């Protein structure tokens, strides 16, 4: 399918799970991971996808399935995922209006755009 | 008593060689762990600790040891 679809499906699945989902169940359940030729290509691809997700900022925790289970799975802490509450609205308008005016460094402008988009997704 | 009787009937514990022996004596009961109401409320057992003095004798060397052993509730 598509890499973006795999990433989005993985994010949603790890968000909605209640216990640590092992990678073996991730292969069969999450769409896009079932088209790999062998178990090593899937393993490397899943490792790279985990690295990308962790570098992005999404909290991807690895831990045991449960007390009496030696399997090791992955989850995403929904409480640590973000912070819902936001402050006033008048100050945020001034912050956005001054978010970026003349900066040219790609990292700076990308970071400012990401922050503005997250603020819009959390109200204005 | 019953405990004294069973300890006396078991006091000499010697091996085949006859060089070592173990003896038990002086059964003693301490205070109760908890009252009846506490035991019934918390699902416990109304019991008291039991301590028996055990003495070890090594016949060949003649050196003897004695300690107070806890036998249970």
């Amino acid at each position: 399918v598509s890499k973006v679809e795999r990433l989005m499906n993985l994010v949603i699945a790890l968000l909605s799970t209640r216990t640590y989902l092992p990678a073996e169940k991730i292969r069969t359940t999450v769409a896009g991971y079932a088209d790999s030729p062998s178990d090593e290509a899937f393993s490397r691809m899943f490792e790279r996808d985990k690295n990308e997700l962790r570098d992005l900022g999404i909290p991807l925790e690895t831990g045991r399935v449960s007390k009496w289970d030696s399997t090791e799975g992955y989850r995403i802490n929904r409480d640590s995922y973000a912070l819902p509450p936001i402050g006033l609205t008048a100050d945020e308008a001034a912050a956005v209006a001054v978010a970026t005016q003349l900066w040219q460094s790609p990292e700076l402008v990308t970071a400012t755009q990401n922050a503005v988009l997250k603020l819009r997704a959390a109200g204005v | 008593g019953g405990l004294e009787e069973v300890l006396a009937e078991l006091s000499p514990i010697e091996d085949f060689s006859g060089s070592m022996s173990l003896s038990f004596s002086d059964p003693r009961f301490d205070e109760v762990k908890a009252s009846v109401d506490e035991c019934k409320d918390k699902d416990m057992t109304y019991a008291a600790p039991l301590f028996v003095t055990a003495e070890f004798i090594n016949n060949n060397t003649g050196e003897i040891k004695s300690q107070t052993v806890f036998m249970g509730d």
């Binding site: 007390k67 009496w68 | 600790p49 806890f70």
Partner: protein
């Protein structure tokens, strides 16, 4: 021991000269065969003469799950190994090496063949160590030791102890008597939880009929799409791409059709009948 070693060497040399060798003289072949047979007889004689230490060693392990004769046989296997590994040059008597091997074999076998649910030896050792530490703590403190004390005195987490204690449970028997007389058993109070309730089945059949009647209020396209997508047709659902390829339409079109059909089905006139089935 010297006879055993001589017989083994003679057998090996005879085997080597049999294939890619030379025509051995008749007397040489006779002597090699005699030495091999003498070595086998000496090995058997040593085994039989030492088949009394095994019983003494196994006497102390009676009453711990395994039977006395099984312990004796495992000790006999250990004795065979000890005979195989005994070296006479060191000058020590056979009763030490034999004791070591017999004890090892008996302990390993009792670790393996004594539980209905088998536990690996590396964990049976941990369970035994935990029990010994618990006994020592009980003697020292005077009270029953809590998991905290065992955690400190066993240099393990205070959680692994719970798992270890929960792995030590032995299954009870379904044939044990419950009452005073001999008419009741534990297996008569156990409910089969995988049997058909005989009421959920008819309810499911009626639900299928009602759902078919409700879905027959739509057009052929939407009904077919829903049946293919949810797997209501025979046994299993399909995916957007597969249904689109079967119907020759893009996946976005299939998604739009499904969204419209689901919106139509949420109308009360199509869900009031099905409300009571959920």
């Amino acid at each position: 021991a010297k006879r055993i070693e001589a017989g083994l060497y003679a057998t090996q040399k005879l085997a080597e000269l049999a294939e890619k060798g030379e025509k051995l003289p008749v007397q040489q072949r006779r002597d090699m065969q005699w030495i091999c047979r003498d070595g086998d007889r000496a090995k058997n004689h040593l085994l039989e003469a030492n088949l009394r230490l095994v019983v003494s060693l196994a006497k102390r392990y009676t009453g711990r799950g395994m039977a006395f004769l099984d312990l004796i046989q495992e000790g006999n296997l250990g004795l065979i190994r000890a005979v195989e590994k005994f070296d006479y040059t060191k000058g020590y008597k056979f009763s030490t090496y034999a004791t070591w091997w017999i004890r090892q074999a008996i302990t390993r076998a009792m670790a393996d063949q004594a539980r209905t649910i088998r536990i690996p030896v590396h964990m049976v050792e941990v369970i035994n160590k935990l029990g010994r530490i618990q006994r020592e703590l009980l003697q020292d403190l005077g009270r029953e030791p809590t998991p905290e004390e065992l955690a400190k005195e066993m240099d393990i987490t205070p959680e692994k102890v719970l798992e270890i204690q929960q792995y030590a449970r032995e299954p009870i028997s379904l044939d044990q008597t419950i009452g005073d007389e001999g008419d009741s058993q534990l297996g008569d109070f156990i409910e089969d939880s995988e049997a058909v309730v005989a009421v959920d089945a008819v309810s499911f059949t009626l639900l299928q009929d009602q759902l078919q009647s409700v879905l027959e209020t739509l057009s052929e396209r939407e009904a077919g799409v829903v049946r293919l997508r949810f797997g209501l047709t025979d046994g299993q659902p399909r995916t957007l791409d597969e249904i689109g390829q079967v119907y020759g339409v893009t996946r976005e079109r299939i998604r739009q059709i499904e969204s419209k059909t689901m919106s139509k089905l949420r109308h009360p006139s199509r869900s009031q009948v099905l409300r009571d089935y959920l």
